[PDB]
């Protein structure tokens, strides 16, 4: 399963996908 980390990189670490 591929997650897309576009805005989550420095403020938080929890990848997801709508």
Swiss-Prot record:
Domain of life assignment: Eukaryota
Protein name (Swiss-Prot/TrEMBL): Alpha-inhibin-92
Protein species of origin: Homo sapiens
Organism lineage string: Eukaryota, Metazoa, Chordata, Craniata, Vertebrata
Gene behind the chain: SEMG1
């Amino acid at each position: 399963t591929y997650h897309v980390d576009a805005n989550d990189h420095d403020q938080s670490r929890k990848s997801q996908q709508y």
